[PDB]
Design an enzyme around this catalytic site. Structure first.
Site, PDB file in Angstrom:
ATOM      1  N   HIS A 270       0.830  -1.239   0.000  1.00  0.00           N
ATOM      2  CA  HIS A 270       0.000   0.000   0.000  1.00  0.00           C
ATOM      3  C   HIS A 270       0.861   1.285   0.000  1.00  0.00           C
ATOM      4  CE1 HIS A 270      -0.084  -0.293   4.611  1.00  0.00           C
ATOM      5  NE2 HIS A 270       0.248   0.985   4.395  1.00  0.00           N
TER       6      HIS A 270
ATOM      7  N   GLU B  76       0.706  -8.385   0.926  1.00  0.00           N
ATOM      8  CA  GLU B  76       0.928  -6.989   1.411  1.00  0.00           C
ATOM      9  C   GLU B  76       2.430  -6.699   1.593  1.00  0.00           C
ATOM     10  OE1 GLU B  76      -1.421  -4.930   1.152  1.00  0.00           O
ATOM     11  OE2 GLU B  76      -0.385  -3.186   1.985  1.00  0.00           O
TER      12      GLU B  76
ATOM     13  N   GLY C 139       1.446   6.013  10.817  1.00  0.00           N
ATOM     14  CA  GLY C 139       2.880   6.338  10.942  1.00  0.00           C
ATOM     15  C   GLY C 139       3.723   5.097  11.207  1.00  0.00           C
TER      16      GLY C 139
ATOM     17  N   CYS D  89       3.152   1.832   9.841  1.00  0.00           N
ATOM     18  CA  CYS D  89       3.241   0.840   8.728  1.00  0.00           C
ATOM     19  C   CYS D  89       4.694   0.782   8.244  1.00  0.00           C
ATOM     20  CB  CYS D  89       2.303   1.138   7.564  1.00  0.00           C
ATOM     21  SG  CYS D  89       0.556   0.987   8.014  1.00  0.00           S
TER      22      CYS D  89
END
Length: 182
Positions: free
Chosen positions: A41, A72, A146, A148
């Site tokens: 992402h 992911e 903040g 990730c």
């Protein structure tokens, strides 16, 4: 403060850079040579900023399992003049649960941040912001924006990177030895 934070600190001091995309600043774990990982992402493009230096992206791969499901994790190769310390021997070979994990973040906003998240469950399937996602770890810490890219370690093992939360729980994409066999 103890041997958990000691291991996490060792990883943060040698194997992390600050990555900036158009989707923001991320903790980014360097694994070996010029090869690093980041949440998919982050939307990595042709160019990325590494510690505020314009860097060409030599390759980027958005990992999916053999069911063709999102993991992911994006593996990124960087046009950088310096190699990372090889930490592939700290990656687990199998999906597993763990005790006494630490989540470590370093950005502009959250420098030198370390969180004792406690027990980590092999959670598996998560619908992550609407995307079916496999190989998810869950910890009962109310993680926020903040964080990730943040690195999830136990004493002796680097087990995943933080990809989201729901206000009660945080979620990490597993790292496995087999992702980084060259």
């Amino acid at each position: 403060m103890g041997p958990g934070f000691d291991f996490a600190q060792a990883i943060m001091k040698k194997n992390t850079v600050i990555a900036r995309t158009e989707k923001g600043e991320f903790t980014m774990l360097g694994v070996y040579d010029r090869v690093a990982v980041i949440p998919t992402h982050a939307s990595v493009g042709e160019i990325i900023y590494i510690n505020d230096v314009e860097t060409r992206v030599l390759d980027a791969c958005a990992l999916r399992d053999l069911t063709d499901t999102n993991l992911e994790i994006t593996i990124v190769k960087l046009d950088r003049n310096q190699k990372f310390r090889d930490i592939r021997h700290f990656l687990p070979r199998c999906e597993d649960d763990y005790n006494d994990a630490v989540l470590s973040v370093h950005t502009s906003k959250f420098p030198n941040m370390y969180i004792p998240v406690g027990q980590v469950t092999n959670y598996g399937f998560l619908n992550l912001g609407g995307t079916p996602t496999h190989r998810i770890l869950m910890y009962n810490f109310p993680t926020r924006a903040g964080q990730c890219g943040g690195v999830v370690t136990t004493t002796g093992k680097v087990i995943g990177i933080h990809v989201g939360g729901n206000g009660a729980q945080g979620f990490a994409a597993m790292l496995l030895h087999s992702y980084f066999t060259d």
